[PDB]
Write a protein that holds these residues in place. Structure first.
Motif, mmCIF file in Angstrom:
data_model
loop_
_atom_site.group_PDB
_atom_site.id
_atom_site.type_symbol
_atom_site.label_atom_id
_atom_site.label_comp_id
_atom_site.label_asym_id
_atom_site.label_seq_id
_atom_site.Cartn_x
_atom_site.Cartn_y
_atom_site.Cartn_z
ATOM 1 N N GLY A 1 -15.761 14.182 3.564
ATOM 2 C CA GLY A 1 -15.833 13.259 2.446
ATOM 3 C C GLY A 1 -14.539 12.986 1.717
ATOM 4 O O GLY A 1 -14.580 12.420 0.620
ATOM 5 N N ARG A 2 -13.402 13.384 2.267
ATOM 6 C CA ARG A 2 -12.106 12.810 1.935
ATOM 7 C C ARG A 2 -11.607 12.055 3.158
ATOM 8 O O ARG A 2 -11.476 12.646 4.232
ATOM 9 C CB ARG A 2 -11.124 13.906 1.533
ATOM 10 C CG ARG A 2 -9.696 13.441 1.336
ATOM 11 C CD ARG A 2 -9.513 12.574 0.119
ATOM 12 N NE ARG A 2 -8.435 11.618 0.326
ATOM 13 C CZ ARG A 2 -7.545 11.257 -0.587
ATOM 14 N NH1 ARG A 2 -7.383 11.941 -1.707
ATOM 15 N NH2 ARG A 2 -6.813 10.168 -0.381
ATOM 16 N N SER A 3 -11.302 10.769 2.999
ATOM 17 C CA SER A 3 -10.899 9.948 4.133
ATOM 18 C C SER A 3 -9.800 8.968 3.756
ATOM 19 O O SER A 3 -9.785 8.435 2.647
ATOM 20 C CB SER A 3 -12.089 9.159 4.676
ATOM 21 O OG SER A 3 -13.200 10.004 4.895
ATOM 22 N N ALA B 1 -7.475 5.595 5.610
ATOM 23 C CA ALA B 1 -7.109 4.701 6.697
ATOM 24 C C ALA B 1 -5.834 3.974 6.314
ATOM 25 O O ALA B 1 -5.707 3.500 5.185
ATOM 26 C CB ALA B 1 -8.224 3.701 6.995
ATOM 27 N N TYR B 2 -4.890 3.883 7.248
ATOM 28 C CA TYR B 2 -3.524 3.500 6.931
ATOM 29 C C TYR B 2 -3.154 2.188 7.609
ATOM 30 O O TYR B 2 -3.634 1.877 8.699
ATOM 31 C CB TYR B 2 -2.551 4.578 7.375
ATOM 32 C CG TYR B 2 -2.779 5.932 6.757
ATOM 33 C CD1 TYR B 2 -2.195 6.275 5.553
ATOM 34 C CD2 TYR B 2 -3.561 6.875 7.391
ATOM 35 C CE1 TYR B 2 -2.396 7.513 4.997
ATOM 36 C CE2 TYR B 2 -3.761 8.117 6.843
ATOM 37 C CZ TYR B 2 -3.177 8.430 5.650
ATOM 38 O OH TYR B 2 -3.376 9.674 5.108
ATOM 39 N N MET C 1 -2.437 2.412 2.127
ATOM 40 C CA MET C 1 -3.740 2.685 2.708
ATOM 41 C C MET C 1 -4.659 1.476 2.648
ATOM 42 O O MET C 1 -4.705 0.761 1.647
ATOM 43 C CB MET C 1 -4.365 3.881 2.004
ATOM 44 C CG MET C 1 -3.694 5.161 2.444
ATOM 45 S SD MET C 1 -3.870 6.560 1.344
ATOM 46 C CE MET C 1 -5.632 6.566 1.131
ATOM 47 N N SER D 1 -8.040 1.888 3.279
ATOM 48 C CA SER D 1 -9.282 2.393 2.712
ATOM 49 C C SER D 1 -9.058 3.807 2.203
ATOM 50 O O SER D 1 -8.211 4.537 2.715
ATOM 51 C CB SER D 1 -10.404 2.376 3.753
ATOM 52 O OG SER D 1 -11.620 2.859 3.212
ATOM 53 N N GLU D 2 -9.822 4.182 1.182
ATOM 54 C CA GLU D 2 -9.622 5.449 0.485
ATOM 55 C C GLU D 2 -10.977 5.925 -0.018
ATOM 56 O O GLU D 2 -11.548 5.293 -0.904
ATOM 57 C CB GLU D 2 -8.646 5.252 -0.669
ATOM 58 C CG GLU D 2 -8.452 6.443 -1.581
ATOM 59 C CD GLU D 2 -7.869 6.047 -2.917
ATOM 60 O OE1 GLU D 2 -8.237 4.974 -3.436
ATOM 61 O OE2 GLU D 2 -7.047 6.812 -3.459
ATOM 62 N N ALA D 3 -11.485 7.033 0.515
ATOM 63 C CA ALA D 3 -12.690 7.670 -0.006
ATOM 64 C C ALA D 3 -12.377 9.059 -0.544
ATOM 65 O O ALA D 3 -11.672 9.829 0.106
ATOM 66 C CB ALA D 3 -13.763 7.765 1.077
ATOM 67 N N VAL D 4 -12.894 9.369 -1.734
ATOM 68 C CA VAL D 4 -12.718 10.687 -2.338
ATOM 69 C C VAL D 4 -13.990 11.109 -3.063
ATOM 70 O O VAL D 4 -14.236 10.689 -4.196
ATOM 71 C CB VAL D 4 -11.533 10.712 -3.319
ATOM 72 C CG1 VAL D 4 -11.195 12.141 -3.707
ATOM 73 C CG2 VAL D 4 -10.325 10.047 -2.721
ATOM 74 N N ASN E 1 -12.764 2.970 -2.069
ATOM 75 C CA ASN E 1 -12.016 1.755 -2.350
ATOM 76 C C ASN E 1 -11.478 1.187 -1.044
ATOM 77 O O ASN E 1 -11.114 1.940 -0.139
ATOM 78 C CB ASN E 1 -10.850 2.041 -3.296
ATOM 79 C CG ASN E 1 -11.280 2.760 -4.560
ATOM 80 O OD1 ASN E 1 -12.228 2.358 -5.223
ATOM 81 N ND2 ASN E 1 -10.592 3.845 -4.885
#
Lengths: 96, 127, 100, 96, 96, 100, 100, 100, 127, 96, 96, 96, 100, 100
Positions: A74-76, A78-79, D67, D69-72, D77
């Motif tokens: 659940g930490r992700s 994408a670059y 980035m 996409s960003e999940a925390v 986001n």
């Protein structure tokens, strides 16, 4: 650039990572200086901000340099595909 | 031996003579026709009883599984067990005397088939 | 659906208990075999009060539907009790479990 | 721009993020002044809002500058591909 | 490059991975020297950072050198299609 | 499937209890090794009444099927009880758990 | 995988209880540090009979495998018990929980 | 992440029980406010032995990390106990629950 | 020492002499062959008994695990324990006297193997 | 190459897999020597690293030679379409 | 090829699969000799490794010779679209 | 072909399926003989392996002849679009 | 939706208990049949205290809505109790279970 | 969101128990109706100690937020207790359950 202005933008007030950031900045400066026309011995001060911007991009990508995505529990992330892609167009348009 | 194993061996020697299979637990690769007997190792209390001996209460459970098609026969097995194991059982080291016997039966549908399950408990005072 | 396998349907018809003879002997009606489709055989550990048994929980499928009452099936040499039957427009689907 | 005009839009009412917002604004001004023709010495006031708008985009993107996409921990986001993209159509159309 | 300059960026502070990093760096130098024209005998210092950057990409990719995606017990990585891809546009543009 | 690993099947044949000697000594039939495919080894904590043990719950796969009765397998030097066997058209798949 | 972090493996070797001195003093074997990869640190509330503690349930990964017996790891200054170890072809993966 | 909201961290420092005065008066250390990001406020029914209360179970996020010990947070005028803290490379994430 | 630890040490000194392993709990990295003994710390009640002493009831449980292949041997271990720990145990500070002993056995399949589990409880009055 | 340098990069300090790696290396050398111009009897030392790089790719792909993806119970791999694809371009550009 | 050279790469150390591997190898030799020009009577030793490599691909694919994807109780494989695909570019390029 | 060589490759040592395999082989031979030039009365021994290979493909597809995918309770297959597609090119190239 | 099947709605109107005659005889109001859409028939095993029964748990759908009170439906010759009714803008959907 | 439906908010204000008259008569504050959006009506069986009731568990949504305290809502002629309220930046969302 200074280190301290990259440091100020990323809000990093301690000194625990200056060894990495000094190598990142030295890398960004060298790459931008590779993208200039062959004659040009110095990075124009008009472009001095790109070094800082890409250094922040690279600071965020620490541990994912070669990776298009990275995830765990659940930490992700994408670059984006190329740090300088926005600026290849600006450097071109300025010399042409 | 304990009174537990002595009694358990006598109850096997008995029930194993009827010609139906007798088991302590069924294993997965083992095919058992109905009817069959399950027999479970006794419990035993012990306490001082005279200046010269212990005495105690030893509890036997034997457990009879059958298809419900014929209940007169299943009850024939129950009565045959009780008549062979009471009033007294006698072995090398120990004597056993029925204090009480309790018979309970259930209709069991756990196996997609209507089985009869009888549990026979016999309490032996032992000396 | 490939309907390759052949199923024999059965009805085990429940008799009244006769207290004079202590018997309630059922009788089996058994039907002609029907083309069906069935899941691959399982042989799971099921863990009853008396111990382990090789169970098989499965689904069987037939085209259109059958006129007649049923309760068990025999297929692949295993006998099953029907535990659900589900009636679509052009197809019937039976959930089945092995007995024992 | 002033810092205060960016500060007002993002709803901030204290001093605790000024050193980041200052460097963000200073970077946006440098970038936009890179996109104008070489003879242009200053961003014309006609475009001054762009520096504010991108400073807000960058304020939201802080900690995700490279980035897609960003999940925390259940907050996710996803980010627009280029901050100045809308304005390239205005800048180019104005000088040419 | 030195080993130490790669070592500094990836944040390592001990000796336990030197024999891998040495062979990674030695491979990156051989590859980049394969991409330059036949008359070129050495990587020019203008490009020396590429050897560092790809040595870091390869350090992260270690144990996945042929793989597009890699999941191991809830940790998942996905990898860029070619380590030198950004630099092909610099190398070619410099000699031609 | 890559069928690299070699499995030894076994049948532990259950003896009758002998009340004169208080023994029920089983006997193992053991077969020639077969090419199989198996999941990576786990060594999970399992928490029995007497304490912790290193358990392994796994699946093993073989091409077509075997003529003969089985109950346990030995592979990778671990002995397992078969707890399901699942019989596809051209393949057989065994769910297995370590003993102990 | 980036194998950045350094793990120290340990074996806590279980001694026999000595009823003359009422002690069962174990001994720790401890190994040279290995490059590993590990999940981000958690510090969850765990709620024991005596109260709250900061627990950490995690996974740790190493390239190929280790010759030697292990039982606990020390990494990031936290000591963990190994509760599963999972052995792939070119990689080993350990499920670990903090002690206390 | 947009780090708009301001959080005040606290440590409630647990005192020893004083049996002469029957008190165990804790003391709160309280820190300067930090920029954070937090989930939207919930006000769920929680159903205690004495009755209903308006609970809030939530997550709070901050860039990099803090040097100092913490135990509770005050934000949006609600006080929470920290019940997990999860430490990524460049970010820290706190699971928090309202007290009462 | 308490009577708990005094008795627990005497029960270890005893069972540890038979040559099978004896444990309080098995740890994950520890390999234990069958058969083996588990031994659990006693409970102890205490109360005033005379104008000059307490007395009380101290409960010992020892617990024997074996594969079911040979039940005569497993029962040999049970009887050997009981014969060494009864009628009385004597130690430095305390005396113990059997009030009763309870033997119960189960067939255990938790471990994908058919084990025998015997639990031996001995209640000692203590003085 | 030696075996020992492929061995050093993959960090493999025992001898349990030398029988496989010697066949993999013998395979990579033969394939690269198939990609050269028909006249060329020897692999140029400029390209000697490709043998090592592909041998590491192949070492990771052991058990998935013909497979584009491979998964079981939360361990998963996905593999790139051709081990030499990066190098077909370099070998071409060097001889042309 | 020998059987032993395929046997070594796939790590086999017993006799229990020889009758399959023999027929796989015999099929690979027949196929490759179908791809060469009509005048060619034997696979040239320059290509001998192809027979080994495809024999390994086919060894993994055994029991899935027509299948794009294969799942069996939590183990899932997906297969490359054509075993000789890489080598068509070598074979054709060599004769033409 | 013989039956016994298809039988050997698929490792099938009993006789329970010879009635199906003899029909499959008779089918593959007839189809290949349909793909040859109209004049050609006999399958060239150069191509004799295709019959065996496709017979194994078809053996695996038993029960899924017309189906592109097939699944039940965690056993799943997905099949390629045409058994002879790899060989249509070889048969063409040999006669042209 | 295809609204092919015809449903008969019912209201079973609950009477007061009459303690002089020991009866509480209900009365059924029953309505004209309505076009509906319904799931395929199931006949699941349900396992009551007295034994097995063939249950059917299902959903039924009608266009717009009905003016009148209802409690049970009869359709396909099975009588069901309504156990939820869910009221969309242009459609009404009833969850129904067989009685017995 | 289409905000078509009109909701009446209420606060039922809890009085102190009066032990001289054995009453704790609450009082309802009731507000002007607000435009809202709400899920389709359910009428589920809920099974209380005294028997079946027609329950409705639902969610209601309003634009921005309300200045004033609330506890119940009346909408569609059904009265609900608020059991969660969830406060987004430009929207408020209430989880509600019917009373009775």
């Amino acid at each position: 650039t200074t280190l301290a202005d990259v440091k100020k933008r990323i809000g990093l007030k301690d000194e625990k990572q200056d060894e990495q950031l000094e190598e990142i900045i030295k890398s960004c400066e060298s790459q931008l200086l590779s993208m200039l026309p062959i004659e040009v011995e110095q990075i124009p001060e008009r472009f001095s901000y790109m070094i800082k911007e890409v250094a922040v991009k690279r600071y965020n990508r620490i541990g994912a340099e070669g990776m298009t995505s990275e995830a765990v529990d659940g930490r992700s992330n994408a670059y984006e595909l190329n740090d300088f892609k926005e600026y290849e167009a600006i450097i071109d348009n300025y010399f042409n | 031996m304990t009174p537990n194993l002595q009694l358990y061996n006598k109850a096997y020697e008995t029930l194993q003579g009827y010609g139906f299979p007798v088991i302590s637990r069924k294993e997965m690769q083992q095919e058992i026709p109905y009817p069959f007997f399950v027999i479970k190792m006794p419990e035993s209390n012990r306490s001082k009883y005279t200046f010269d001996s212990y005495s105690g209460d030893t509890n036997l459970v034997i457990d009879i599984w059958s298809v419900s098609d014929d209940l007169g026969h299943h009850d024939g097995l129950v009565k045959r067990c009780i008549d062979d194991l009471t009033p007294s059982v006698k072995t090398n080291d120990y004597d056993f005397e029925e204090d009480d016997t309790n018979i309970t039966q259930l209709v069991d549908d756990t196996t997609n088939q209507e089985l009869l399950h009888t549990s026979i408990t016999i309490s032996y005072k032992t000396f | 659906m490939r309907y390759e396998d052949r199923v024999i349907f059965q009805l085990e018809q429940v008799a009244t208990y006769n207290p004079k003879t202590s018997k309630k002997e059922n009788t089996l009606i058994t039907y002609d075999a029907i083309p069906c489709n069935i899941n691959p055989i399982s042989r799971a550990r099921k863990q009853l009060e008396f111990g382990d048994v090789k169970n098989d929980v499965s689904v069987l499928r037939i085209k259109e539907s059958i006129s007649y009452p049923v309760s068990h099936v025999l297929v692949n040499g295993i006998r099953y009790k029907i535990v659900d039957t589900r009636i679509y427009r052009h197809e019937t689907s039976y959930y089945i479990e092995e007995v024992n």
